[PDB]
Structures are given as structure tokens and as C-alpha cells.
Coordinates of C-alpha atoms in Angstrom, one line a residue:
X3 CA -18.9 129.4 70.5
X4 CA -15.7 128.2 72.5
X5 CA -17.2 130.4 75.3
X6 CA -20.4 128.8 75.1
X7 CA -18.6 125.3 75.8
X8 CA -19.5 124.3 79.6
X9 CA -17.1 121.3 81.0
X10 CA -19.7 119.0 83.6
X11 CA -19.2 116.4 85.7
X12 CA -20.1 114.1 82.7
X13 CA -17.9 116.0 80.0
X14 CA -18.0 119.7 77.9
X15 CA -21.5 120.0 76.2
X16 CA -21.4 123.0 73.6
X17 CA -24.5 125.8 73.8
X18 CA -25.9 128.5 71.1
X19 CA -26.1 132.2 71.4
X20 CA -29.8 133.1 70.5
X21 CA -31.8 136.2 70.2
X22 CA -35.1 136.5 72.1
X23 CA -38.5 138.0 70.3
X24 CA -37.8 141.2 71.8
X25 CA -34.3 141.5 71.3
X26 CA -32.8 140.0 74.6
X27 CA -29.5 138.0 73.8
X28 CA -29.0 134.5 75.4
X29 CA -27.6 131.3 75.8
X30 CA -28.8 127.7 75.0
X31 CA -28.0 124.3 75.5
X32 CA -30.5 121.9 74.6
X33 CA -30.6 118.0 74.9
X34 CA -28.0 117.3 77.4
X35 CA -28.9 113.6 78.2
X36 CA -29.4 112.9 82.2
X37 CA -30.0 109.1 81.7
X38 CA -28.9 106.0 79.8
X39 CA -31.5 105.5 77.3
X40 CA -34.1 103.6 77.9
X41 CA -34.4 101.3 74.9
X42 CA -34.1 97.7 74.3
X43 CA -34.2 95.5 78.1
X44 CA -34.2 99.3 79.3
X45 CA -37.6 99.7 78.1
X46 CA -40.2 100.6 80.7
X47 CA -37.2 100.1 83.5
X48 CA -36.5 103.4 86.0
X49 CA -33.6 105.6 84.8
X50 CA -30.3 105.3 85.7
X51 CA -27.3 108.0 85.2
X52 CA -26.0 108.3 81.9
X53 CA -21.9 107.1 80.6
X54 CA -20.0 110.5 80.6
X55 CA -18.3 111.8 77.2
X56 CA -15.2 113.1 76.2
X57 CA -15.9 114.5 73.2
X58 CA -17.8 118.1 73.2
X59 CA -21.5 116.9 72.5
X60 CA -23.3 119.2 70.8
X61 CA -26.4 120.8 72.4
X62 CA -27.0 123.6 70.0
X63 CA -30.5 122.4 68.6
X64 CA -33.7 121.3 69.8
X65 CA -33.6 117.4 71.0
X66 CA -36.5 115.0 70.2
X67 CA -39.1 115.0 72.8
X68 CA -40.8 111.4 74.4
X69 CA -42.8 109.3 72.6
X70 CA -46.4 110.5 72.1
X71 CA -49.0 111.5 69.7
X72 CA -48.8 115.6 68.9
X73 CA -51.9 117.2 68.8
X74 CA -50.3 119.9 67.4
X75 CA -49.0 118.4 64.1
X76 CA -51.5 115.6 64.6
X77 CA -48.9 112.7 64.0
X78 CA -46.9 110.2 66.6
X79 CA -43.6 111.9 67.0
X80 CA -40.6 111.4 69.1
X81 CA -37.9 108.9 70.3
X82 CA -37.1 106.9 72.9
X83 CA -33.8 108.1 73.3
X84 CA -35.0 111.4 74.8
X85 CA -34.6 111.5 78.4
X86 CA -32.7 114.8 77.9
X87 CA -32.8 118.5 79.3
X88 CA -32.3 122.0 78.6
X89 CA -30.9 124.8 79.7
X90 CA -31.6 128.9 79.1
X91 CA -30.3 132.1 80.6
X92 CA -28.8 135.6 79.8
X93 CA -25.0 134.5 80.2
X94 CA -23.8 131.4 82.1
X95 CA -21.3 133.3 83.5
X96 CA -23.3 135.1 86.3
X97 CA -21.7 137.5 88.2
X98 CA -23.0 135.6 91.5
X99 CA -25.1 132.3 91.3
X100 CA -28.4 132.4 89.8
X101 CA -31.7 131.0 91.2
X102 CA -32.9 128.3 89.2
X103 CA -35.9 127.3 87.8
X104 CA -37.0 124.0 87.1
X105 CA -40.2 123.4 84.6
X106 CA -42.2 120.1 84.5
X107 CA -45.0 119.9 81.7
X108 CA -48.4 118.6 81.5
X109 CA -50.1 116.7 79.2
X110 CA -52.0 114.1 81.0
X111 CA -49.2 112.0 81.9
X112 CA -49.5 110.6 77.9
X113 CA -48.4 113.1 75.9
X114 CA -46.3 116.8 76.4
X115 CA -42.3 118.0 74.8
X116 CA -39.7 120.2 76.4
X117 CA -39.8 122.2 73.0
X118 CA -39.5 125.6 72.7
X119 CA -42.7 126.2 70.2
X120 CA -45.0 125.6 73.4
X121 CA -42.1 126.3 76.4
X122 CA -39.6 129.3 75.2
X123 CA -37.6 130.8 77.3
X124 CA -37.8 134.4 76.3
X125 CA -40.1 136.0 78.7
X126 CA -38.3 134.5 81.8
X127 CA -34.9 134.8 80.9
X128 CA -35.4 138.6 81.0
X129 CA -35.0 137.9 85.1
X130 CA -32.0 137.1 86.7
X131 CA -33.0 133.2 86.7
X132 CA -31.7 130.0 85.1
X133 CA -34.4 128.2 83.3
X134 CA -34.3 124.1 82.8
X135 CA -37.0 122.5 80.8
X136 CA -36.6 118.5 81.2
X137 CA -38.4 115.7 78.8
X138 CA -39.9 112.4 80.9
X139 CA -41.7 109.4 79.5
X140 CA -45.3 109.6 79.0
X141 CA -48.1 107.3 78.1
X142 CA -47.1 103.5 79.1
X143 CA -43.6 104.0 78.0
X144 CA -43.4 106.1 81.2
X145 CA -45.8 104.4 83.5
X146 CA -46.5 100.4 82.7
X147 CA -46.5 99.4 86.2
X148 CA -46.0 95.1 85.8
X149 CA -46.6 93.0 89.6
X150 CA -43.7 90.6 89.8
X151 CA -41.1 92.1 91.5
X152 CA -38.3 90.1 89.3
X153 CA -40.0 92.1 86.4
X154 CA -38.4 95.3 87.3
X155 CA -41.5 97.4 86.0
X156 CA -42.2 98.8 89.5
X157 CA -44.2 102.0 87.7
X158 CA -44.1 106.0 87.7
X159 CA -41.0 105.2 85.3
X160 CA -41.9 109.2 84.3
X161 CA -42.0 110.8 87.5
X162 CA -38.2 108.9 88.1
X163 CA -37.2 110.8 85.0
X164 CA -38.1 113.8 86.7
X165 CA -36.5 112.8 89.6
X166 CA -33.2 111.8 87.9
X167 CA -33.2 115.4 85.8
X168 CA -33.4 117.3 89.6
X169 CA -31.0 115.3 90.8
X170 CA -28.9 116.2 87.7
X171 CA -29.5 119.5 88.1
X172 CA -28.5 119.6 91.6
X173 CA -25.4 118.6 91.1
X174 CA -24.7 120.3 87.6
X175 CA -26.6 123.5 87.4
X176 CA -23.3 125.6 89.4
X177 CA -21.4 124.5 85.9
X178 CA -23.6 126.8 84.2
X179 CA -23.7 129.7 86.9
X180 CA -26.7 128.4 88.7
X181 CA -27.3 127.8 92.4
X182 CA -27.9 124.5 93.5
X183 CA -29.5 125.3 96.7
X184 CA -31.7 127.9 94.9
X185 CA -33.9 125.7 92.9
X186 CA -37.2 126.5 92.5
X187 CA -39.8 123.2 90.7
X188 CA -43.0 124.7 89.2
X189 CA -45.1 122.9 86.4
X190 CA -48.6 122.9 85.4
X191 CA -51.5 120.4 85.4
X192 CA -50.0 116.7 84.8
X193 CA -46.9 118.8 85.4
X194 CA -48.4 120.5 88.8
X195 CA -49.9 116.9 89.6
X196 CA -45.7 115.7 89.4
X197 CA -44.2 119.1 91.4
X198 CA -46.5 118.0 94.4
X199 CA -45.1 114.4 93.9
X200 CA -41.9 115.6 94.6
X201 CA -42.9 117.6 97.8
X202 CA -44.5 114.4 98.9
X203 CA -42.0 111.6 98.2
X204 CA -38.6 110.5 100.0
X205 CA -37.3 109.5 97.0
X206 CA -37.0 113.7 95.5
X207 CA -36.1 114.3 99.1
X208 CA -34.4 118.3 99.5
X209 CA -33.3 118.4 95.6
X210 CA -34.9 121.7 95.4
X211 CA -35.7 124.4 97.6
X212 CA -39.4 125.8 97.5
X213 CA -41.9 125.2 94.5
X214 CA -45.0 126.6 92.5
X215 CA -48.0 124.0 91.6
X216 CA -50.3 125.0 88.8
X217 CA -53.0 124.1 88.2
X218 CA -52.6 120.4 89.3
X219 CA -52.2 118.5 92.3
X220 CA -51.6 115.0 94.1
X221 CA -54.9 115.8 95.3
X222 CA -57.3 115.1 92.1
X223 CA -58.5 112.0 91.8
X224 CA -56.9 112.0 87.7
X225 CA -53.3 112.4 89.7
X226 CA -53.4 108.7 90.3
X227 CA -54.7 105.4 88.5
X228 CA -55.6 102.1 90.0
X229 CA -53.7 98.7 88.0
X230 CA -56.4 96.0 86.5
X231 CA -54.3 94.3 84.1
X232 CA -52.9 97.1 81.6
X233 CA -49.8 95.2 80.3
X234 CA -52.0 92.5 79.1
X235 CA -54.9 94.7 77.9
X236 CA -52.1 97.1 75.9
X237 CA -50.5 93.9 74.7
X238 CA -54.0 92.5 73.6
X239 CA -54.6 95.2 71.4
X240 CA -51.6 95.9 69.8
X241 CA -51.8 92.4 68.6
X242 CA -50.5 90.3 71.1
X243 CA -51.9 86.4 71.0
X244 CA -51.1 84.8 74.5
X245 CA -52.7 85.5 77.6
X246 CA -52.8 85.5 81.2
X247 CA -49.2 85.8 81.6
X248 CA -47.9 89.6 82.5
X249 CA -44.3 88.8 82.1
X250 CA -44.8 87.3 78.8
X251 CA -47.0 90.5 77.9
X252 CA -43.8 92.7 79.0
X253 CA -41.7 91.1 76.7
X254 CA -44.3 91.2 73.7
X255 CA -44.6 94.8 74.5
X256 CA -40.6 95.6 74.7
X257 CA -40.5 93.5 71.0
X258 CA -43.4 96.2 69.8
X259 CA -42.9 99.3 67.9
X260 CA -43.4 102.6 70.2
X261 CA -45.6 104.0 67.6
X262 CA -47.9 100.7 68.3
X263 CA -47.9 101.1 71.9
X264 CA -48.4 105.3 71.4
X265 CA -51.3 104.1 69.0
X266 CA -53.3 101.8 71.7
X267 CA -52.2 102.9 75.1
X268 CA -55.6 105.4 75.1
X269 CA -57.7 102.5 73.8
X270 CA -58.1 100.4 76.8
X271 CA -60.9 101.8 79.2
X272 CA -64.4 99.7 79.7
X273 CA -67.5 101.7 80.9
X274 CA -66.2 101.4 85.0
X275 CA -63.1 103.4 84.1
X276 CA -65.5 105.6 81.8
X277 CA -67.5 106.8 85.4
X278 CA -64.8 106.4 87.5
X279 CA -63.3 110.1 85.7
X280 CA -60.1 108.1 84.8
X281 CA -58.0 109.9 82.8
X282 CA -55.3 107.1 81.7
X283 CA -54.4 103.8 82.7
X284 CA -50.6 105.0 82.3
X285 CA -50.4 107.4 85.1
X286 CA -48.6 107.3 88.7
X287 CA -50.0 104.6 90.5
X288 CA -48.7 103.2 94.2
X289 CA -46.3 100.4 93.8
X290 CA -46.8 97.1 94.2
X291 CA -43.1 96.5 95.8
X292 CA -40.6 98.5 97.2
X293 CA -37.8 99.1 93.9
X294 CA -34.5 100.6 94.7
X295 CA -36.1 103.8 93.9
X296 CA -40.0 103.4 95.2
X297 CA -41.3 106.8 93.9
X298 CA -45.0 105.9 95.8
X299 CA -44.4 103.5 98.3
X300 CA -48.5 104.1 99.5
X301 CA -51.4 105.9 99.7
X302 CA -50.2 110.1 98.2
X303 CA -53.0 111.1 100.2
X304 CA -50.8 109.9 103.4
X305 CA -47.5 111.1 101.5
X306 CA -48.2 114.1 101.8
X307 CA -49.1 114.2 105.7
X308 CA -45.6 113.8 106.7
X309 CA -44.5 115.4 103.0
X310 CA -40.6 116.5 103.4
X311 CA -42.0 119.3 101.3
X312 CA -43.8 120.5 104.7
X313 CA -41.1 122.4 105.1
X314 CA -40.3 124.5 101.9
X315 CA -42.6 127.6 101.1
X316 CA -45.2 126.7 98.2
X317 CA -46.5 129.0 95.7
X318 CA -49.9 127.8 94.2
X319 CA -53.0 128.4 91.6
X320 CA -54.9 128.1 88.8
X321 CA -57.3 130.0 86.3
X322 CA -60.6 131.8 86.5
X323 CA -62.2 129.0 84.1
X324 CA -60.0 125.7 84.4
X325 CA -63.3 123.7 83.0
X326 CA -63.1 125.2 79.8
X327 CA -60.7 122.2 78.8
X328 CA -63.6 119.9 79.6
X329 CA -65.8 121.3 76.2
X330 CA -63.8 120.3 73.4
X331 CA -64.1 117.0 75.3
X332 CA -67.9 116.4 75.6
X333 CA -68.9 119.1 72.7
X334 CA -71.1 116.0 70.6
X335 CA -72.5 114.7 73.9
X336 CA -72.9 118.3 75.5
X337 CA -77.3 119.1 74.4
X338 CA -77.9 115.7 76.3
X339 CA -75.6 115.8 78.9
X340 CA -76.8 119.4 79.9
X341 CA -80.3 117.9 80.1
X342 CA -79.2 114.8 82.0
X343 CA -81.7 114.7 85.2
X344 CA -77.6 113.1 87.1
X345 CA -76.0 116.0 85.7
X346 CA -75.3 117.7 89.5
X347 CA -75.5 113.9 91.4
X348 CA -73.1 112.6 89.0
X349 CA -70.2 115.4 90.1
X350 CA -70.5 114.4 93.4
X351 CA -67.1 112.4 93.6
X352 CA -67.9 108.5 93.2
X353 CA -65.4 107.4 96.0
X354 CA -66.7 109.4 99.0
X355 CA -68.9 107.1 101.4
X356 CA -72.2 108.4 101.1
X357 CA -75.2 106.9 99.8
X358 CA -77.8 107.5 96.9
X359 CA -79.9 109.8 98.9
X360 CA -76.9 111.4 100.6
X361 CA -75.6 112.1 96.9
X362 CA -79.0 113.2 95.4
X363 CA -79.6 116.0 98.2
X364 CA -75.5 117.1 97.3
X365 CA -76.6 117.3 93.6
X366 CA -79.5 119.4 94.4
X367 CA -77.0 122.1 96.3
X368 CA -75.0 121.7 93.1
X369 CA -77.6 122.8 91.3
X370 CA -78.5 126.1 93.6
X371 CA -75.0 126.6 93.4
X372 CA -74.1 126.8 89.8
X373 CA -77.7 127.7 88.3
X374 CA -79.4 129.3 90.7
X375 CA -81.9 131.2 88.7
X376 CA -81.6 129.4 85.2
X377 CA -81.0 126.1 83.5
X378 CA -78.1 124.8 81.9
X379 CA -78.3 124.6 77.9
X380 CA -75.7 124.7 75.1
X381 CA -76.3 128.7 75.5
X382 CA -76.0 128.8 79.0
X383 CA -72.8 127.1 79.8
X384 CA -70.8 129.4 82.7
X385 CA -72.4 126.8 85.8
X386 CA -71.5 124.1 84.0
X387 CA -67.9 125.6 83.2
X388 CA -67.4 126.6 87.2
X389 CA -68.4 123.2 88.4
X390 CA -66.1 121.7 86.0
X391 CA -63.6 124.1 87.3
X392 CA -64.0 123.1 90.6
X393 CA -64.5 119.3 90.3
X394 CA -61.1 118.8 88.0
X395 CA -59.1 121.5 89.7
X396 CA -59.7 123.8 92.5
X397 CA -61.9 121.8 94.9
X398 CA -58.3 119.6 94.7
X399 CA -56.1 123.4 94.9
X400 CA -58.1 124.2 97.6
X401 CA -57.4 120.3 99.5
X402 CA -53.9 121.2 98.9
X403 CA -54.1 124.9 100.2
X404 CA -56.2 123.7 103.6
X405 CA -53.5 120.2 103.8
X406 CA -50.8 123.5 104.3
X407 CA -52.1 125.6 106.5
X408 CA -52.2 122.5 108.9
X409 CA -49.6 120.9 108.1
X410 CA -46.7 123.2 107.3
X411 CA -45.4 125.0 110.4
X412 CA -43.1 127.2 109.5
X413 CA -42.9 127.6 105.8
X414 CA -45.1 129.8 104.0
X415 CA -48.2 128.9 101.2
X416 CA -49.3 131.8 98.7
X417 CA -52.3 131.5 96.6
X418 CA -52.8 133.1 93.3
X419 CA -55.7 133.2 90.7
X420 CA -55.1 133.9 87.2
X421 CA -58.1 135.6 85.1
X422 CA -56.7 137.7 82.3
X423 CA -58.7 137.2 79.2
X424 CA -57.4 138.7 75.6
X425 CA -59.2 138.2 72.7
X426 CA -55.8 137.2 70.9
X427 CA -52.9 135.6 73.3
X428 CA -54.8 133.4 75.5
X429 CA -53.5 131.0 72.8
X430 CA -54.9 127.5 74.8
X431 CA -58.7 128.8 75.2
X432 CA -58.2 130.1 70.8
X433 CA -56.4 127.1 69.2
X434 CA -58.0 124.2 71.9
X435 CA -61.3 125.1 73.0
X436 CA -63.2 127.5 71.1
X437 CA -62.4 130.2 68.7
X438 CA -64.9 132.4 70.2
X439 CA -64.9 131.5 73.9
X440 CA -64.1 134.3 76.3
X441 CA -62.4 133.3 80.1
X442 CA -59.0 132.1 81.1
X443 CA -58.7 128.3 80.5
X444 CA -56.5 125.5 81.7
X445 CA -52.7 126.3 80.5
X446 CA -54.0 130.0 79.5
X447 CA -51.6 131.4 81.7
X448 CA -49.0 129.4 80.1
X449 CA -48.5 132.0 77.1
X450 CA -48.2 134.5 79.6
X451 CA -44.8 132.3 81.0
X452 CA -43.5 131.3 77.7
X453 CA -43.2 132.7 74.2
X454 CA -44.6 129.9 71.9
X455 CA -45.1 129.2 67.9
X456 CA -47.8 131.1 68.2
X457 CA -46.6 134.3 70.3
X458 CA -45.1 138.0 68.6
X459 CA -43.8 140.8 70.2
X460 CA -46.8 142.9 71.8
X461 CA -46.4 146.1 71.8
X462 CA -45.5 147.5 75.5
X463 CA -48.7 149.1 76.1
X464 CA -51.1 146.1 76.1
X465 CA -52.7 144.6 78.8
X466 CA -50.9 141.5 77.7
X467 CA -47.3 142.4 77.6
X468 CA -48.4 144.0 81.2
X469 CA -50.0 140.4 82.0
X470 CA -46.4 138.9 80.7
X471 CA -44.3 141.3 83.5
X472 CA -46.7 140.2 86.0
X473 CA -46.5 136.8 85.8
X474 CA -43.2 136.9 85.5
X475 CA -42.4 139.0 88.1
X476 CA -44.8 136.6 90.8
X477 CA -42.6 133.5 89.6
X478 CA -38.9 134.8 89.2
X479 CA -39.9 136.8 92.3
X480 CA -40.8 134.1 94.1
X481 CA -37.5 131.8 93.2
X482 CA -35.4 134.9 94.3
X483 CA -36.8 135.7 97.4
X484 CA -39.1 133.2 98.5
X485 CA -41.5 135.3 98.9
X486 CA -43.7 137.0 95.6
X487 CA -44.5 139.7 96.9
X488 CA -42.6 142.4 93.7
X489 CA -42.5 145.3 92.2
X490 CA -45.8 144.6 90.6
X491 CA -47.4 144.2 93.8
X492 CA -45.9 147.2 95.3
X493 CA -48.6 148.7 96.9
X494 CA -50.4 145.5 98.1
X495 CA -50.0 143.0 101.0
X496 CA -50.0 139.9 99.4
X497 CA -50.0 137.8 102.2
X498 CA -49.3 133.7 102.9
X499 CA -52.1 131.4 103.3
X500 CA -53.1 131.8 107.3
X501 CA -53.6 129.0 110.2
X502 CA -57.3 129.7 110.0
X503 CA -56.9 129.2 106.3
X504 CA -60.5 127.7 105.6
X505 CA -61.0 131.2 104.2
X506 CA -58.0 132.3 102.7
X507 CA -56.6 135.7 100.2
X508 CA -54.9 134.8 96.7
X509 CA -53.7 137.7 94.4
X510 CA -55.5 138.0 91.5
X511 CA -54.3 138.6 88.6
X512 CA -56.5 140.5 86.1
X513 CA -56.9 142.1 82.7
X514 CA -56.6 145.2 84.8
X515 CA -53.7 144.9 87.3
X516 CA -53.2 142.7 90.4
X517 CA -55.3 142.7 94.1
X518 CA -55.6 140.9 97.0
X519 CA -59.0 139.3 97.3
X520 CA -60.8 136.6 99.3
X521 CA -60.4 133.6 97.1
X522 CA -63.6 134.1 94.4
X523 CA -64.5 130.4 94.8
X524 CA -64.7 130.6 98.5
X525 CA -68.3 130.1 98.5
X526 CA -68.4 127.3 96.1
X527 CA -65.6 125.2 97.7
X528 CA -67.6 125.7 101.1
X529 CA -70.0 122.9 99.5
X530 CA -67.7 120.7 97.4
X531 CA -65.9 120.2 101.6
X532 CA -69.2 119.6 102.4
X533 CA -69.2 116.1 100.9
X534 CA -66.3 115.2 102.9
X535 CA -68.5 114.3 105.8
X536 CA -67.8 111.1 106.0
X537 CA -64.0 111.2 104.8
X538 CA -60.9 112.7 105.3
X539 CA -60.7 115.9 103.2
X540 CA -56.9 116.4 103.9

């Protein structure tokens, strides 16, 4: 125990010794706080550093995640006083500085924990890496965005969480036998939508050193969310009487419970946010003033043209099916929405400048594209699943990936594609989507990353524990050497995205093993920049 007490900058914080499912020993510390928390006035308010401690705080269990409703357990859970972070490795007493490796989750931007049922640290840990998981507020406890500059409610509340846990990792992590100028950021969708927002904005500006993006980006349009009024609408519906008046709907919302604003803060879209593909009206959104830290200041789409982030290497990917995640969403609606004569003009996204016509003539290439010899039905669902794929996700990958090969000139892009399909451990596609569904969905790759409630030791000789080394080995490769290019690609040339890049290699990563391939969706995303003709794809 005394051992496994680490004196910081703020005061000792005491870890736990733990065991790994496969019998690896390491070491813990869980809930260090890296803010002052945001309750009471501080409600809603951007972070600020939290009062240090003399007393050895104990960080030897699992901390309380942020406010949000838990599909898991299928009950609000959380606390407000949970802007806290964690920290895993083999020893904190390195021989040499470790890299590190910094984790942001998804979730939408409303919901998502830190905790190690869904993010263990088992499988990485194996490496020679420290791992930091970090909670930040979700829903519209982490992104109300209110107008009046005297308000202080500037917005992106959660991505300044972020921000403040790099920052305290930064200057902390060499406590605990990490490298400070060897951080690597990685996270996946809402969470690969926030890494980008760190390579784009001033405000994270060199707190870490190169970064993976999965299955996210700054690029889809669900990344960012216009303000009509939400304070007031949230207010409204909780139970609030006045109107009219945003400041007086802030302070009605700082007197409500957090379970009543968890409770309503999905309930407030009308039929133009319904078409729009809005996923939340608590998301990051551009500020309306500059704060003293103005984590959007404009336009992402024009952040990341002159991104500081231009200049650190990128790893970045996704799945073979990403759309899978959209069934479970439209199952009731799916027989008439499959038979909708708009199905194919309606993906064709709403903002581009291009008229009725223009968009009908896109739909019908949509159509050749994903059902070229067959029509879509209930039974026949693998075009609809790839343009889903390809409208949520990798049309917006693929944005990012061409935005680097003209942008970054020096540092390095590599693209990978993640298809392994197991009939057990692909636990997202089993417990969210469908029982029976084959593919690799959205956040299937994420068992392959971390051991989870619903993960056992697999017996060495699977596919699956071989998927696990590879995965691995990509990532922790990649925060070691820059470069993730391993072992496990030995006998490949994995190589970084080219100047030409419109065409561009990823390493694939397959039930069988690991190649180099043209990017599969090459031909597809050759139509979705088609509809760019009239605006600026990157």
C-alpha cells in the first residue's frame, strides 16, 4: 500500500494493487479529482483546477461517473461531483518514462462513464504504456450554451473537462512514471468527435503529442449543434413557468434536480431538428463570445485548416459496418422506411447547396450504389447498413483523411479498418444491436481495447485473443513509436496516408490476420465527394 502512495503537485493520492483477467499484476488509482466541482453557482460554468489536499485521498475504488441515464442498468446514475480521472499501469515506478495514453469516451455527448465494466485496463496494460481514462460532463450539464456573456455559460462545458484532465495530465502523469511529452489522445465516436477537437482548437494547444480518432470526427455533421433556445426549452419542460428570459431559465435550471434535467434534456427536438440528423441539442456548439477559455471560437470546419494538430502524426478509423448502430434506432419504422420512394434523396446531406433535381439525380446514384441489383427490405438490409456507414461515419473519416493529406506537411496520417466479426466478443453488435447480426459495428472494436463486464479470458488460440494482440499492438505501437507499423505487421508495409491521398491504403484488420489494402469504401466515398460540387469538402 505505502508503495502505492504517489505525492502530486496537489497532495499523496493512495492506488490498489489489482490482478488482470489473465493474471497480469497492476496498479490503480481511480478518482483523482482534476477540477473543483461543479455544483451549486458552479453548475454549467467551465472547470477550474481543483484546492490541493494534505491528507492521502484515497483512490483505491471506482469513482462515480457524470450525470446520465445508463443504458446499461437502465436507471439515471451519477453525480455531479465527478470530474475525476484514473490511472492504470504495470508499476508506476518505470524503469524509464512511460508513453501515455489518454482515453476519451463516447456516448453522444449525453451519456458515457470512465468505469472499468465498459473501459478496463487489462488488455493495454500488458504494453509498456500508462493508461488515463477521464470522466466529462455530458448531456446539458456539460454543454448548455446560455447568450449573455455576463451569464458565464459560454458552452462545450464537457470538452473543457477534457481539456482541464490533459492539462492535468501534462503536468502530473511524470509523478506516476509517465512521460509528459509522450502522450498519445485516442477516443472513439462522441469521444473521436472530441480527440479531433483537441487537434483543432488553441485552447488544448501541444498538451499531447500525436493522436488516434475512432470512429468520430469534427467532420460529421452530429459533431456540432446549432443554439435555438435550449435553456428555455429544457427549463419549460422540467416544469419551469416564466418565459422569455434565458438568465432566469439558468437559474431555474441550477435550482433543478440533475436527475430532472438528465430526465428532459433528450425531450426537446421539433420535426426541423428531427430532419436535420441532429443528434442532441447538448453538444459542442461555436460560442457566442469569446470566455477566458473559448474552446470553439468559429466555424470547426475552419479550425481545423490552420489545426495546431497539423503538425502531430494522426492515427485514424473505423469498422467494416459502423451503420449497424442506426437499426436498433429505426427497427419499428424500418418496413416503411425501406420502402420510402426519399430513402436514397433523403441521405443526400441537407446543408449542401444543391437543388431538388440536383439531389434526386444523387439519390438515384445512391441507389446503383448500394442496391444495384436488388431492393432493400427488412431481409435485405447490407445497402442500407453501408450507406448508413458511410453517411454517419466514413464519408466524414474520409473528410478528415483527405483535410491531412493537404494540410499536414510533415507529420504523418495512417488509416486503419477494423472488420473482425466473432460470433461471441463483438459484445456492442450482441447486447445493442441484434443478437443474431453478423459484421463489426460501431464500438465493436472497443472489446477488442478493453476487458469489460462482459469479457473472460479467451483461450490463446482464438481469432479473438489474436484480434486483442493486434489491436493492441497498432495502438500502444503507435504511442511508442509514432509510427504503427509492429510486430503484428511484420511482414507488411503499412504505409502513411500519401499527398495524392484521394485514393489512399488502411491496414485491415480481419478475422484472419492484418493486410494492406486500398481503402474497401474507396468506390463508395468517390460519390458521397461527389455532392460536394458546390461546397467545400475540406
Amino acid at each position: 500500500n505505502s508503495e502505492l502512495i504517489v505525492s502530486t503537485g496537489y497532495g499523496p493520492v493512495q492506488g490498489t494493487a489489482r490482478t488482470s483477467l489473465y493474471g497480469t499484476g497492476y496498479v490503480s488509482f481511480q478518482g483523482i479529482p482534476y477540477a473543483k466541482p461543479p455544483v451549486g453557482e458552479l453548475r454549467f460554468k467551465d472547470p477550474t483546477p481543483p484546492e490541493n489536499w494534505t491528507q492521502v485521498l484515497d483512490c483505491t475504488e471506482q469513482c462515480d461517473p457524470c450525470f446520465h441515464f445508463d443504458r446499461r442498468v437502465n436507471k439515471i446514475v451519477g453525480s455531479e461531483d465527478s470530474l475525476r480521472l484514473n490511472i492504470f499501469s504495470k508499476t508506476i515506478k518505470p524503469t524509464k518514462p512511460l508513453p501515455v495514453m489518454v482515453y476519451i469516451y463516447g456516448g453522444g455527448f449525453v451519456e458515457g462513464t470512465s468505469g472499468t465494466e465498459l473501459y478496463g485496463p487489462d488488455y493495454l496494460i500488458e504494453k509498456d504504456i500508462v493508461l488515463v481514462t477521464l470522466n466529462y460532463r455530458v448531456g446539458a450539464l456539460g454543454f448548455l450554451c446560455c447568450q449573455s456573456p455576463t451569464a458565464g455559460v459560454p458552452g462545450n462545458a464537457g470538452l473543457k473537462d477534457q481539456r482541464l484532465a490533459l492539462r492535468w495530465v501534462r503536468d502530473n502523469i511524470a509523478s506516476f512514471g509517465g512521460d509528459p511529452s509522450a502522450i498519445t489522445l485516442f477516443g472513439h465516436s462522441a469521444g473521436g468527435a472530441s480527440v479531433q477537437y483537441h487537434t483543432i482548437a488553441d485552447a488544448s494547444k501541444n498538451l499531447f503529442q500525436r493522436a488516434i480518432i475512432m470512429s468520430g470526427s469534427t467532420m460529421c455533421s452530429w459533431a456540432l449543434t446549432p443554439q435555438r433556445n435550449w435553456p428555455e426549452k429544457l427549463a419549460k419542460a422540467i416544469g419551469w413557468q416564466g418565459e422569455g428570459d434565458e438568465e432566469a431559465a439558468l437559474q431555474y435550471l441550477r435550482q433543478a434536480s440533475p436527475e430532472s434535467i438528465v430526465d428532459h434534456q433528450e425531450k426537446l427536438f421539433g420535426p426541423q431538428e428531427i430532419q436535420e440528423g441532429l443528434l442532441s441539442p447538448f453538444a459542442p456548439t461555436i460560442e457566442p463570445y469569446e470566455s477566458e477559455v473559448c474552446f470553439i471560437p468559429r466555424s470547426p470546419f475552419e479550425m481545423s485548416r490552420t489545426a495546431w494538430g497539423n503538425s502531430i502524426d494522426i492515427m485514424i478509423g473505423g469498422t467494416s459496418e459502423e451503420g449497424l448502430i442506426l437499426l436498433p434506432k429505426v427497427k419499428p419504422q424500418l418496413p416503411s422506411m425501406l420502402q420510402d420512394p426519399r430513402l436514397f434523396v433523403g441521405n443526400v446531406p441537407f446543408h449542401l447547396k444543391l437543388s431538388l433535381e440536383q439531389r434526386m439525380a444523387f439519390g438515384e446514384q445512391l441507389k446503383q450504389l448500394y442496391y444495384p441489383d436488388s431492393n432493400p427490405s427488412i431481409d435485405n438490409l447490407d445497402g442500407f447498413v453501408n450507406m448508413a456507414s458511410d453517411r454517419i461515419f466514413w464519408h466524414d473519416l474520409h473528410r478528415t483523411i483527405l483535410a491531412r493529406a493537404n494540410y499536414a506537411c510533415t507529420a504523418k496520417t495512417f488509416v486503419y479498418r477494423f472488420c473482425v466479426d466473432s460470433p461471441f466478443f463483438n459484445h456492442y453488435r450482441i447486447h445493442m444491436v441484434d443478437p443474431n447480426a453478423r459484421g463489426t459495428s460501431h464500438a465493436d472494436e472497443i472489446s477488442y481495447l478493453f476487458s469489460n463486464i462482459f469479457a473472460k479470458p479467451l483461450d490463446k488460440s482464438t481469432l479473438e485473443y489474436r484480434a486483442i494482440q493486434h489491436l493492441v499492438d497498432i495502438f500502444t505501437s503507435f504511442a511508442t513509436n509514432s509510427d504503427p507499423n509492429c510486430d503484428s505487421t511484420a511482414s507488411l508495409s503499412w504505409t502513411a496516408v500519401p499527398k495524392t491521398a484521394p485514393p489512399y491504403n488502411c491496414l485491415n484488420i480481419s478475422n484472419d490476420g492484418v493486410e494492406v489494402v486500398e481503402l474497401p469504401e474507396s468506390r463508395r466515398l468517390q460519390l458521397w465527394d461527389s455532392f460536394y460540387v458546390n461546397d467545400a469538402l475540406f
